[PDB]
Design a protein around this ligand. Sequence first.
Ligand SMILES: *[C@@H]1O[C@H](CO)[C@@H](O[C@@H]2O[C@H](CO)[C@@H](O)[C@H](O)[C@H]2NC(C)=O)[C@H](O)[C@H]1NC(C)=O
Ligand SMILES: *[C@@H]1O[C@H](CO)[C@@H](O)[C@H](O)[C@H]1NC(C)=O
Ligand SMILES: *[C@@H]1O[C@H](CO)[C@@H](O)[C@H](O)[C@H]1NC(C)=O
Lengths: 97, 214, 48
Amino acid sequence: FVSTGAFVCESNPEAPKTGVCVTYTVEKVTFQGVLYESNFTFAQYYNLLYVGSQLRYVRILGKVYEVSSCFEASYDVLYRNNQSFGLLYRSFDCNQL
Amino acid sequence: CESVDFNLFNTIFSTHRGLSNTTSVITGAYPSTNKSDWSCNTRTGHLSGSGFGIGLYVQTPREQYDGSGAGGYTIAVSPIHVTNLTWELWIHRKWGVNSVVTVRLCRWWQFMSGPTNAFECLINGSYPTHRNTGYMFGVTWYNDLVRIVFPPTVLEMQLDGLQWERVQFNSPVNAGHATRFNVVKDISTVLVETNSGGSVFRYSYCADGFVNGL
Amino acid sequence: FKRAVFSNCIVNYTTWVNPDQRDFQHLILSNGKFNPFTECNGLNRIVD
Ligand SMILES: *[C@@H]1O[C@H](CO)[C@@H](O[C@@H]2O[C@H](CO)[C@@H](O)[C@H](O)[C@H]2NC(C)=O)[C@H](O)[C@H]1NC(C)=O
Ligand SMILES: *[C@@H]1O[C@H](CO)[C@@H](O)[C@H](O)[C@H]1NC(C)=O
Ligand SMILES: *[C@@H]1O[C@H](CO)[C@@H](O)[C@H](O)[C@H]1NC(C)=O
């Protein structure tokens, strides 16, 4: 192994699924969220992009995906008994969907 | 030299991440802003020269109004005490004026000068580049981290041991123009500011004055 | 002996042995068995 980071790998990676929360791991940086297609273009030196300190864009197979936080990862239980409880998702906005 | 474009230095700087709208401090082997380090105007036939540095940066002057006369910049970076199992680099270009350059970091068996083919070659590709208003590139071996910077892209390989010092660069002398070369000796520290998408558009080297260090 | 540089490419299944399935079987571990190394120094031996 003359170099670290040349990365011979079986089975070339494929386009990810846009619209489901999944914990990715892209170029030594693991993160969790959903992806969507964007018309945002950034510098070819970089695949990851940071706005401040949060990951905002990834670039996979030449396609730029804007990273969003998945809002349904956490909930409270308004617990009364075994057959009656309520659920509250404190960080999800259910105005539309 | 005399006509070194210092506004082309923006195209070669990179931060370690992709950062948006951000002022950052980067360090490494970056080209000298002193005009007394750009070997540019040699008419003696020794435009070849050599260097004992840690990288080299090349800047083609301008291509807007010779024509077909472009740079050649044959670069043969040497692992100063050469054996059979060491690594050399040989970046080559002809007059063009079309795109095709070549890199070919291979493992050769002699020192005198780039045959048809060699054994055990790590990178071997064309990677074509188009001429711009003015173009600037450079390759870097600082603690054996090879960085071939052809803007916009980049190529990085951390090899375990090279000990590259000798450069043996060479351009076609007495050409239509004179491409300028910069052999870097020590690492610097630069204050850069990136734009919307992550591209550097302002720089200041930290050791070029009193205010620059503040 | 001729060498090969492997970088930025896709290695393929068991195309470093002869297609007979008796000889190479000393490099078989488990159901995941495509392991071309025997003793490793000092990296972790299993290639997955
Ligand atoms: C980086 O900076 C630019 C410039 O400040 C930002 O562009 C602005 O974006 C807002 C939307 O949030 C617009 O209302 C402004 O009109 C834009 N200004 C200009 C001058 O274009 C950009 O959004 C910033 N952030 C990035 C790229 O993530
Ligand atoms: C949820 O609503 C349904 C309505 O039939 C019923 O099971 C119950 O009233 C509520 N709570 C739970 C825990 O099911
Ligand atoms: C390098 O690339 C050229 C062009 O494809 C080819 O002719 C040559 O054999 C290659 N050399 C090696 C060592 O792969």
